Every structure is written in structure tokens, then in C-alpha cells.
Amino acid sequence: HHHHSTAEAGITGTWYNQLGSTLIVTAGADGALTGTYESAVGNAEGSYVLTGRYDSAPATDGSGTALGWTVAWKNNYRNAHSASTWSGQYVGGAEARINTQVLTTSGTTEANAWKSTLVGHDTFTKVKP
Ligand SMILES: O=C(O)CCCC[C@@H]1SC[C@@H]2NC(=O)N[C@@H]21
Ligand code: NI
């Protein structure tokens, strides 16, 4: 099913997901995403560093803008020994969204690697749900 036939201004700022988490991101001119993430759930307290990338020249045919970012869940307060990656697309307009699927991998022994990774889906909006 996979194949092949500003974003910057739209992405930069604060976003909120359906769990009550807060994303604070700056999109750089050459594809960088940098900022912080605060999770409303899980083994998390305060803000965590986030870094990622986005397509800085997306298609102009009504398609979304591909992007992704990572948070390692270690900061000055807690270390969950886990990291999450969100993969998705930014959809602009009056009801802008970042629609993502997210993998959360915990450090495990080899015996437990089969249960290392969660998959979920987060939808981000510019106003709090
Ligand atoms: O408990 C952990 O291992 C660290 C916190 C994980 C929180 C996850 S990341 C995917 C989902 N979306 C969120 O905003 N919070 C949870
Ligand atoms: Ni956890």
C-alpha cells in the first residue's frame, strides 16, 4: 500500500493530545523538530527533551506533512527506562492536527523482549481537548 505518486509555520508551537499531554515543538527551516514533551499519563513527571524531523517541502496536492519525533523518558525527576517514537502527519487548516501512531519501547531482558514495545495512537490539536 506504500508508494509514491508553510509546514514549518504550521507545526511550530504547542499541541495537546487526547490524553491531556502537551507537546512544545519548534520546526526548523531544514527539517528539524526540537522541543519538549509533558505526558499526562505513565511514569513521567515534568518535561522531557524531544527531537525529530519533518518533511520541510511537503506535497501541494492536499496531502499531509510527514514527521516523527522521539522522547527518551529520562529527565531530572524520573527515569522510566523507556523511549517513545511518534510517526505521523501534520494536517493544516482551521482544524489543524498532528495524527500519529506511537511506539513505546521499554528496556527489557532478552527473555522479555517480546513484551518490550507498546503501540498506540495519539491525535494532537492546537486547543486542549
Ligand atoms: O511510562 C513510561 O514508560 C513513560 C511515559 C510514557 C507515556 C506514553 S508515550 C505514548 C502515550 N502518549 C502520551 O502522551 N503518553 C503516553
Ligand atoms: Ni510506563
Summarize this structure briefly.
This protein is mainly beta and 129 residues long. The protein has one helix at residues 7-11, and strands at 13-17, 22-27, 32-38, 48-54, 65-74, 79-91, 97-106, 117-125. It has a single domain (1-129), classed as Avidin-like (Lipocalin).
List the main descriptive attributes of the protein structure presented here.
1 helix; binds nickel (II) ion; binds biotin; about 130 residues; mainly beta; about 5% helix; Lipocalin; eight-stranded antiparallel beta barrel
Your description of this structure?
The chain has 129 residues and is mainly β. It has a single domain (1-129), classed as Avidin-like (Lipocalin), CATH 2.40.128.30. 4% of the residues lie in helices and 52% in strands. The chain is built from 1 helix and 8 strands. An 8-stranded antiparallel beta barrel has the order 1-2-3-4-5-6-7-8. Strand 1 (13-17) and strand 2 form a beta hairpin. The radius of gyration is 15 Å and the shape is globular. Bound molecules: biotin (BTN) and nickel (II) ion (NI). The site of biotin (BTN) has 16 residues, from strand 6, strand 7 and strand 8. Its main location: secreted. Belongs to the avidin/streptavidin family. Homotetramer. This is Streptavidin. Residues 7-129 form the Avidin-like domain. It is classed as biotin binding protein.
